[PDB]
Amino acid sequence: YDALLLDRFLDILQDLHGEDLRETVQELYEHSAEYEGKHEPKKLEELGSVLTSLDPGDSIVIAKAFSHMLNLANLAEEVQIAYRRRIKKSDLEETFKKLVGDLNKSPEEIFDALKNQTVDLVLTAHPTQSVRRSLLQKHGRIRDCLAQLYAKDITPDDKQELDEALQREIQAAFRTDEIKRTPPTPQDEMRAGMSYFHETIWKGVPKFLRRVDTALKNIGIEERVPYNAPLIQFSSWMGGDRDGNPRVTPEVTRDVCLLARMMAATMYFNQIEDLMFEMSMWRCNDELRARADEVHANSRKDAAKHYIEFWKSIPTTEPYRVILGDVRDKLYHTRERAHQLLSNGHSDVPVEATFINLEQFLEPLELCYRSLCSCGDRPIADGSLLDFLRQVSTFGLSLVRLDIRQESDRHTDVLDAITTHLDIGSYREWSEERRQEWLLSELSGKRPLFGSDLPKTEEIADVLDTFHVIAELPADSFGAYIISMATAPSDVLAVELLQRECRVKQPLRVVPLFEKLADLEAAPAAVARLFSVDWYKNRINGKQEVMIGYSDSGKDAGRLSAAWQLYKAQEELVKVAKEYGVKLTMFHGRGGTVGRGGGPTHLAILSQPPDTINGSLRVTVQGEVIEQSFGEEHLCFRTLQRFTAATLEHGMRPPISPKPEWRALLDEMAVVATEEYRSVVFQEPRFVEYFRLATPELEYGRMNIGSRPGIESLRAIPWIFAWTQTRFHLPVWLGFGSAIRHVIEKDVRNLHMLQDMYQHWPFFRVTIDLIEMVFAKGDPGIAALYDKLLVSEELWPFGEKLRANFEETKKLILQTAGHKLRLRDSYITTLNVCQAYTLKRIRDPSYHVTKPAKELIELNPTSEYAPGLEDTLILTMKGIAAGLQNTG
Amino acid sequence: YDALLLDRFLDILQDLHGEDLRETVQELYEHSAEYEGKHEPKKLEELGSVLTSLDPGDSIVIAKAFSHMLNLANLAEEVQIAYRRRIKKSDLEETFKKLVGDLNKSPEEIFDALKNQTVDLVLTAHPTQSVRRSLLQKHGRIRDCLAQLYAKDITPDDKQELDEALQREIQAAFRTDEIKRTPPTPQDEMRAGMSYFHETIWKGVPKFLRRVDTALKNIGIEERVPYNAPLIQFSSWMGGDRDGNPRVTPEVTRDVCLLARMMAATMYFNQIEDLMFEMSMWRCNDELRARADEVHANSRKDAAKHYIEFWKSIPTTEPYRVILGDVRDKLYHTRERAHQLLSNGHSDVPVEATFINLEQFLEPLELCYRSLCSCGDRPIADGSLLDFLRQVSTFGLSLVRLDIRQESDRHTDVLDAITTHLDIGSYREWSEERRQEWLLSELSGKRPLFGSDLPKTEEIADVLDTFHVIAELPADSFGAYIISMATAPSDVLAVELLQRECRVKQPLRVVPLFEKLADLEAAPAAVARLFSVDWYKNRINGKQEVMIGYSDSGKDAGRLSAAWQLYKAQEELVKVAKEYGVKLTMFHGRGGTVGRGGGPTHLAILSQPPDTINGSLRVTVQGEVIEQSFGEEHLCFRTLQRFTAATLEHGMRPPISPKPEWRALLDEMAVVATEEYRSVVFQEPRFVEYFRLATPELEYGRMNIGSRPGIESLRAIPWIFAWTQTRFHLPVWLGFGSAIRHVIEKDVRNLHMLQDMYQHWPFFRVTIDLIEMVFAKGDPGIAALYDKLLVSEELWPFGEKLRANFEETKKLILQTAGHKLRLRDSYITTLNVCQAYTLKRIRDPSYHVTKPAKELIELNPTSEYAPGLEDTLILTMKGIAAGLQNTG
């Protein structure tokens, strides 16, 4: 069946570029097949020999072909998964069943625990989404074609029109320039993010909630999940995170807030007329009748011809239509106000004509629901009205709540400008205690701090202006202010005072981000010291959120040491919060790649220490992962299901807590793994050299994914990208070899203890299993070829050392777990080869450079490199990322 | 399987009103079952005995229950038909096959004949739609539930959510007041009409055209139907027909025109952004590149923040997106202009910023298509861009072209006011010749006619003002001006002069409506006399349309005589048009009931005389029929298919022309049938009395369907309604008995001649077959019960006479054709009984009359009749109409 796609696409490729190129693509596929079958490293060079003969444009066409083949492979993969899962006639109903039988838990415990459960998915604009939006659309259409094709109810003409349709849709996808020739603006990032709502999430959320209701009734719970029960929520960083992205200005934040608000209003307004049409009942209780009489009193007997439907004043015969009629008027005026406020700088639309409250909207719908149930119409109320109630209570007046992230040192600079200007010292030079005492005195004091006459840098004025932008805007549009590189309470208090002094009427919660490993070690101490401040503990109102970063941890230290220290961090943070009687919710900055803490969601949730979630979870959805988890109805449902089921199980089925022997064993193991990791990644003075030669790291910024413009000093995203492109995955597995070897060396019974740990400890089981998966996506012959083609003859053995470790480490992993699809790896291998030789040509002086476009080579006329080369490189990176189903 | 619906609905009924009422509904169903099985007329009285015992509100609930049961029966009927037809894995591909094999016709003849074929469906607001819109919505949802239920791919939870959904949707439909408590405005009629576009027709048309392309490729025609090939078009009367509807004012016509324009703009604008997203190509020919450079020149480098997507100036990289970008700007400004022009009286939006031409819109899309095909992207161009091209070329700037219908005598009054005021005579008193000569002199003269100082009646000023309204508005918004009761060229010339003098810049075509039988006899003479006028023949530009009414013909004369005279009328009209070298297209004012010329569409088309269509047809879709032919994707497709296939076959497979013996035989037969019909419907002086007692005719106006406020003097719609409610159908079959009896009497070989005619003449075969169908929907026991309950003891035998004829006539029908589901007739019979006894209670003096609502009896507090009775009567009419699948 894998052959069908090859047939259709290759027929189209032949229809576009002739027999010859189709035949050379087939040759490359056959060489790659002989390689992924026999694994003769001679086959690689055999393939590169055929690859070097290519024309400028021809190699572009080859890279294009294999990349689109990988994409189609992903799409057919998703289709086959959806159908395979559907033809069954963890999981929600299964999780309920296991909670009842295994753990003897009652239905009302599941229901009550469910009501008080919340999962806050926060979408980020992290530059990990390799596929441009113009192509993502065509992918969506194409998987629609393939999904409709996968059925036995096709009529001949339907299938032929879908053949013509899929053919035209592939031909359209291939006819688009895959290369972002300019990097997006943060606004574009926020649009790419929000586009999944008026595509999937908006309609997906109420369907999922219906499904939870159904599953709850399969357990005997006739009651339904409360419409205002916040089982899932959405937050955003798009346009808010300005950490090291100076292009995220205050005006950008204003723009994304106003934008999102306009989107939400528009969606509600388009829903509201259909809802009015259905709410044609005439029975209501005395309450809704009284209110309907109120609205029909101020009915404004006018033409109201701007509407299409219901332009006549609604009669009291159908009172639900009266009340919903006022709801439509207030929606119209809310949309018009937001659209004017966005399109110009201002609006003449009166605020009282609009919904100002998150529940001025909810109130009339709640009333309709009470009336319907009162009058025996709970079936009716649980339909479109309920869907609408859940959409309002879930999305509010601004589809997502925006977080503002900024690094502590910028707040420090602001305060230092203030104290210098006030002739009182230098906040920078001040000790922590001095900062705390001063900040406290200013927060509890009543005199304004700086004035209009404060000297400001562009950076200083950037952060002050972002605070003014936050104050100017509605409170329910924002989420949390995340402080990067937070180390002391002076940073949180600093942001609090900077908010109060920027007249932020309802200041948002402040939350620290500990991402470097030392910050994770020191974090519980800092949180306890913050809670010690009686002022903050009294204003924090018993609730605190703190973010836990996964990107930079496994970058400077061992991936293993990072994971273990994270576990300790969650544990001790919960300890501290309980010690001060504060409800802690921890914010997990997980990525899509395992190297940034990614991997399957239920596995990452089960690997959390027990009694650390307590019905309140928060996870990042990093750029690319959005597409993976919300681009289809089915993906959206499977995502929301995975999250809610994992959290519920982790709530009622607490994972086993580690025996102390396991604690100490992992402490030693963490020392060994850290020394091993840092030994090869930092001690080696020629390591940075070999890295900058052997991996496509430095070229990452060429793809222009995001809007953000030593090895310790690079972002974790291109770090994991480099080693994942080459399918070597060094940062995933490094410390494990020395770790396990030293642990079995110090004691032989530690082998039985590792076997013991792998079978009972969810954290260890998850860790080892993930390492084994990453090994399964590994092939060291690739990194070998890259070394042979690009590394100087000198330090060739260095890589082999690592390669040694690779196999060694794998041998240990399979030994602790007790273990002993393909074909896509064929295409990937081809692109691997293409990526390798092309890099050698790029780092040559002969291939350097010293109107409309009618062919691909004309697409890059400003290339500092040879005409056809830059585009081909970008193509190889994109394609390999697609094949591996991860970018960074 | 019929039992499933009964089970679900009766369970809901029990959940709403208890066991007792469910049990009495079951008793009624059982009595009706014993009646429709055994046909014991004692069973009817047995049922009425149980019916008379009912409470005021209880009988309302019973009528409600049987009516909704009939509706559900209709919906399940449609579902089972759609699935039965789909599980085949006339008709389009079958029609092509028969045209190739049977008639030896070539593909290019089918294709070329198809290109030059046009079918103009014109939706009317005729008050035949019994089901109010608030309920039609719920019906749509309910058939959605049932359609999704009819499958073997249901997952358990899907089926349970659809059970809860169908339950809540039925419960919602039943909880709505079925009674229109106030009659609609013409604007409401036009909304009910147009609502099928942004529901079905808008998306249905391009899908149907794709299907025609597919069928054409199954014959070997790789080419596609031209996007601008006008295979189907839509016109409207809603808000335009003012014949005997004085509530259709000029402001109403303005309103429906502006309204429709706003709807169209909105739909295009919502499509355009998705189209822009897909047209991401970079290759274009020098033409589209030049134009894209033009647009990017005047690009207006601005924020353009009112849009959500593509708010940044579009780069020349993606030229299709540039050109489509200008298209989106001109759409935005067109929508804003129409919305302001509607909501206020005026707009500041510049006209040059909008699409003014029907093809200023089409031009940029045509350019994109040429470019795409030029660059080898015909597959891409035949996708969303083609769908959009067909939508634009098919729907234009105003979704439908509006006809204006008005009776001749009103134009006569206008002209008479003018000639009286000009001290020149009285146009009324003038002979036809004088009218012709004067009208001609004024049309070819250059002096204005009346001035501001013309004395005007409210009627006169109504028609003059409608002409000013037509002149003020865009030309492509209007269709034809239909003249009711047109008899002479003076009427058409009158409208032409009245247009020119009202400064109608681009005057619309004038078309006469001949509906009374004498007008159909005299019509060809009048058309020839009109074409004799050299002026009109020169300005008519070789094209003429004339309407042929079906409503009033079979009302004053025999249904048979009417059909035959219609055939002659089409024939001789075509003769006359060919004689004057003018392309005639005839406009068939067909209804939904056979008594108004309704019946299956392909049968009505085959019954047209040969060489009378010639690739140009025009048919009314009377009120209720709209719902029947466009309320579902499948209904819409089946409608467009039926029409286009019928016209094509009638074009290439001309029906046999009648032998002269058949001609004369039908002339005699028409005399006999006319004498027989008029003998019982007009000669009898007590006939009007018996009619006003035995049928629910007089109560029709109580349903408040439409906005329009002797027996010869009533509308044909309540005429057919009366006899169809009672399932007697007198106007369908009356003259056939005497006709066939006299024809077999004058000669015995005429029996073999009738057998000969039924097997070879499409017109006769259709006629007789239709009569047999109507008989199959007949049961004279019903009319018997109505007579027994409501007719005075005196003229009881009169009806029996008719009843005699009934059987007699049926015996003849089955004899010329050579011939010898049920259960739903059960429910109908119950309502029959309920309708009968209730009428007897209504026409009683004891049951006459000399805040919010918390129960059904409170729903009519102004009833001149007893509290519960009026509503129950309306309910019975609605339900019986639903069961018979026809209103009038």
Q: Distance (Å, rounded) from C-alpha B520 to C-alpha B510?
A: 18
Tell me the nearest-neighbour CA distance from A379 into chain B, angstroms: 5
DSSP helix/strand/coil, A401: strand
- State in Å, rounded, how far the first CA of chain A is from the last one: 31
Expressed in percent and rounded to 5, the helix, strand and coil fractions of chain A are 65, 5, 30
Q: Which of B68, B411, B555, B650 is catalytic?
A: B555
B259·A308 Cβ contact <8 A: yes
- Residue of A131, A171, A312 to mutate for B, most B C-beta atoms under 10 A: A171
Helix (H) or strand (E) run with residue B232 in it: strand B232-236
The closest of A375, A360, A355, A399 to A279, measured between CA atoms, is A375
Which residues make Cβ contacts (< 8 Å) with residue A190, sequence separation at least 6?
A: A125, A236, A238, A239, A255, A256, A259, A260
The torsion angles phi and psi of A514, rounded to 5 degrees, stand at: -100, 110
DSSP helix/strand/coil, A481: strand
The closest of A500, A660, A615 to A113, measured between CA atoms, is A615
**Nearest residue in chain B measured CA to CA from A306:** B343
Residues of chain B contacting A209 with CB distance shorter than 8 Å: none
Q: What is the resolution of this structure in A?
A: 3.0
Q: Are B331 and B272 within 8 A, CB to CB?
A: yes
B172·A377 Cβ contact <8 A: yes
DSSP helix/strand/coil, A403: strand
Using alpha carbons, list the distances in angstroms from residue B360 to A881, B227, B331, B364.
Answer: 45, 16, 11, 8
Q: Distance (Å, rounded) from C-alpha B65 to C-alpha B54?
A: 14
Q: Distance (Å, rounded) from C-alpha A340 to C-alpha A334?
A: 10
B377·A854 Cβ contact <8 A: no
Q: Distance (Å, rounded) from C-alpha A873 to C-alpha A696?
A: 9
Residues of chain B contacting A332 with CB distance shorter than 8 Å: none
- The CB density around residue A609, as the number of other CB atoms within 10 Å, is 22
- Which residue blocks in A445-516 are alpha helix, DSSP H? 458-472, 489-501
Task: Give per-residue burial for B95-114: e unless 16+ CB within 10 Å, then b.
Answer: bbebbbeeeebeeeebbebb
Q: DSSP class of residue B685?
A: T
How many residues are given for chain B? 888
A177·B282 Cβ contact <8 A: yes
Expressed in percent and rounded to 5, the helix, strand and coil fractions of chain B are 65, 5, 30
Q: Distance (Å, rounded) from C-alpha A425 to C-alpha A421?
A: 9
Q: Are B795 and B690 within 8 A, CB to CB?
A: yes
A225: Cα separation from own chain's centroid? 27
Using alpha carbons, list the distances in angstroms from residue B439 to B184, B423, B492, B540.
Answer: 39, 16, 10, 16
Task: Specify the experimental method.
Answer: X-ray
The torsion angles phi and psi of B528, rounded to 5 degrees, stand at: -60, -45
DSSP helix/strand/coil, B713: coil
Q: Distance (Å, rounded) from C-alpha A283 to C-alpha A60?
A: 68
Burial tier of A851 (Cβ tally within 10 Å: 0-12, 13-18, 19+):
exposed
Q: What is the 3-state secondary structure (H, E, C) of A310-377?
A: CCCCCCCCCHHHHHHHHHHHHHHHHHHHHHHHHHCCCCCCCHHHCCCCCCCCHHHHHHHHHHHHHCCC
Q: Distance (Å, rounded) from C-alpha A605 to C-alpha A615?
A: 12
Written as six digits, the tokens of B76 are 């399940």
Q: Distance (Å, rounded) from C-alpha B8 to C-alpha B526?
A: 60
Q: Which amino acid is at B447?
A: R
DSSP helix/strand/coil, B172: helix
Q: Distance (Å, rounded) from C-alpha A224 to C-alpha A214?
A: 9
- Residue of A196, A221, A255, A278 to mutate for B, most B C-beta atoms under 10 A: A278
- The CB density around residue B455, as the number of other CB atoms within 10 Å, is 11
A380·B175 Cβ contact <8 A: yes
Using alpha carbons, list the distances in angstroms from residue A836 to A62, A616, B564.
Answer: 15, 46, 85
Written as six digits, the tokens of B821 are 């589901």
Which residues make Cβ contacts (< 8 Å) with residue B290, sequence separation at least 6?
A: none
- The CB density around residue A647, as the number of other CB atoms within 10 Å, is 26
Facing B161 at nearest CB: one of A175, A176, A214: A214
Helix (H) or strand (E) run with residue A762 in it: helix A762-776
The closest of A426, A322, A390 to A640, measured between CA atoms, is A390
Which residues make Cβ contacts (< 8 Å) with residue A421, sequence separation at least 6?
A: A450, A454, A455
Q: DSSP class of residue B656?
A: P
Q: With both helix axes pointing from N to C terminus, report the angle between A186-194 and A250-278 in degrees, rounded to the nearest 10.
A: 20
Q: Distance (Å, rounded) from C-alpha A744 to C-alpha A753?
A: 9
Written as six digits, the tokens of A443 are 């927060």
Q: Degrees (nearest 5) of the Cα angle A679, A682, A687?
A: 100
Q: Degrees (nearest 5) of the Cα angle B128, B129, B134?
A: 160
Written as six digits, the tokens of B863 are 């009833």
Catalytic annotation present for B555: yes
- State in Å, rounded, how far the first CA of chain B is from the last one: 31
The closest of A35, A39, A59, A38 to A47, measured between CA atoms, is A35
The closest of B636, B643, B647 to B207, measured between CA atoms, is B636
B340: Cα separation from own chain's centroid? 31
Q: Are A596 and A602 within 8 A, CB to CB?
A: no
B134·A160 Cβ contact <8 A: no
Q: Are B255 and B239 within 8 A, CB to CB?
A: yes
Q: Degrees (nearest 5) of the Cα angle A784, A788, A794?
A: 110
B255: Cα separation from own chain's centroid? 21
Residues of chain B contacting A156 with CB distance shorter than 8 Å: 89
Q: Which amino acid is at A40?
A: E
Written as six digits, the tokens of B186 are 């013409």
- The CB density around residue A27, as the number of other CB atoms within 10 Å, is 13
- Residue of A187, A223, A273, A305 to mutate for B, most B C-beta atoms under 10 A: A305
The closest of A207, A212, A215 to A93, measured between CA atoms, is A215
User: Which are the residues after which chain A is interrupted (C to N > 2.5 Å)?
Assistant: 89, 709, 820, 850
Residues of chain B contacting A309 with CB distance shorter than 8 Å: 191
Listing DSSP states for A46-80 in one string gives HHHHHHHT--HHHHHHHHHHHHHHHHHHHHHHHHH
Q: Which of A555, A588, A602, A650 is catalytic?
A: A555
Q: Distance (Å, rounded) from C-alpha A347 to C-alpha A351?
A: 10
Q: Are A113 and A652 within 8 A, CB to CB?
A: yes
Assign residue A591 a region (left: φ > 0; alpha: ψ between -120 and 50; beta: otherwise): beta
Task: Name all contacts of B522-527 with Cβ < 8 Å and 24+ positions apart.
Answer: B522/B487, B523/B569, B523/B572, B523/B573, B524/B569, B524/B572, B524/B573, B524/B575, B524/B576, B526/B486, B526/B487, B526/B488, B526/B489, B527/B573, B527/B576, B527/B577
Q: Which amino acid is at A485?
A: M
Using alpha carbons, list the distances in angstroms from residue B414 to B408, B417, B464.
Answer: 10, 5, 8
Q: Which of B17, B31, B43, B126 is catalytic?
A: B126
DSSP helix/strand/coil, B585: strand
- The CB density around residue A84, as the number of other CB atoms within 10 Å, is 9
Written as six digits, the tokens of B233 are 């078009």
**Nearest residue in chain B measured CA to CA from A139:** B278
Q: Are A764 and A810 within 8 A, CB to CB?
A: no
DSSP helix/strand/coil, B849: coil
Q: Distance (Å, rounded) from C-alpha A140 to C-alpha B277?
A: 12
Tell me the nearest-neighbour CA distance from B556 into chain A, angstroms: 40
A280·B853 Cβ contact <8 A: no
**Partner residues linked to A510 by β-bridges:** A481
Assign residue A9 a region (left: φ > 0; alpha: ψ between -120 and 50; beta: otherwise): alpha
Using alpha carbons, list the distances in angstroms from residue B606 to A436, B322, B653, B761, B766.
Answer: 94, 49, 10, 10, 8
Which residues make Cβ contacts (< 8 Å) with residue A70, sequence separation at least 6?
A: A824, A827, A828, A831, A879, A880, A882, A883
Q: Distance (Å, rounded) from C-alpha B727 to C-alpha B733?
A: 12
Using alpha carbons, list the distances in angstroms from residue A590 to A90, A554, A558, A586, B590.
Answer: 21, 12, 17, 12, 68
DSSP helix/strand/coil, A281: strand
Assign residue B818 a region (left: φ > 0; alpha: ψ between -120 and 50; beta: otherwise): left
B281·A161 Cβ contact <8 A: no
Catalytic annotation present for A568: no
Q: Distance (Å, rounded) from C-alpha A11 to C-alpha A9?
A: 5
Residues of chain B contacting A852 with CB distance shorter than 8 Å: 289
Q: What is the 3-state secondary structure (H, E, C) of A575-612?
A: HHHHHCCCEEEEEEECCCCHHHCCCCHHHHHHCCCCCC
Pairs across A and B, CB distance < 8 A? 145
Written as six digits, the tokens of B403 are 């006809």
Q: Distance (Å, rounded) from C-alpha B685 to C-alpha B675?
A: 16
Domains of chain B: which residue ranges? 1-85+131-179+660-704+710-884, 86-129+185-261+399-654, 262-398
Q: Distance (Å, rounded) from C-alpha B737 to C-alpha B810?
A: 8
Using alpha carbons, list the distances in angstroms from residue B760 to B292, B519, B600.
Answer: 61, 30, 19
A215·B157 Cβ contact <8 A: yes
Residues of chain A contacting B198 with CB distance shorter than 8 Å: none
Task: Give per-residue burial for B540-556: e unless 16+ CB within 10 Å, then b.
Answer: beeebbbbbbbbbbbbb
Tell me the nearest-neighbour CA distance from B882 into chain A, angstroms: 21
Q: Distance (Å, rounded) from C-alpha B35 to C-alpha B255?
A: 52
Q: Are B707 and B189 within 8 A, CB to CB?
A: yes
How many residues are given for chain A? 888
Using alpha carbons, list the distances in angstroms from residue A18 to A12, A50, A64, B523.
Answer: 10, 18, 15, 66
Task: Name all contacts of A210-214 with Cβ < 8 Å and 24+ positions apart.
Answer: A210/A387, A210/B161, A211/A92, A211/A637, A211/A641, A211/B157, A211/B161, A212/A92, A212/A114, A212/A644, A213/A382, A214/B157, A214/B160, A214/B161
Q: Degrees (nearest 5) of the Cα angle B475, B478, B484?
A: 135
Written as six digits, the tokens of A351 are 């605020």
Task: Decide the pairing of beta strands A616-622 and A118-124.
Answer: parallel
- The CB density around residue B747, as the number of other CB atoms within 10 Å, is 11
Helix (H) or strand (E) run with residue A120 in it: strand A118-124
- Which residue blocks in A384-431 are alpha helix, DSSP H? 386-395, 408-421
Q: Which of A64, A68, A126, A729 is catalytic?
A: A126
A134·B280 Cβ contact <8 A: yes
- Residue of A97, A154, A175 to mutate for B, most B C-beta atoms under 10 A: A175
As separate numbers, helices (DSSP H) first and strands (DSSP E) second, chain B gives 37, 8
A283·B86 Cβ contact <8 A: no
**How many CA atoms within 13 Å lie on the side-chain side of B81?**
12
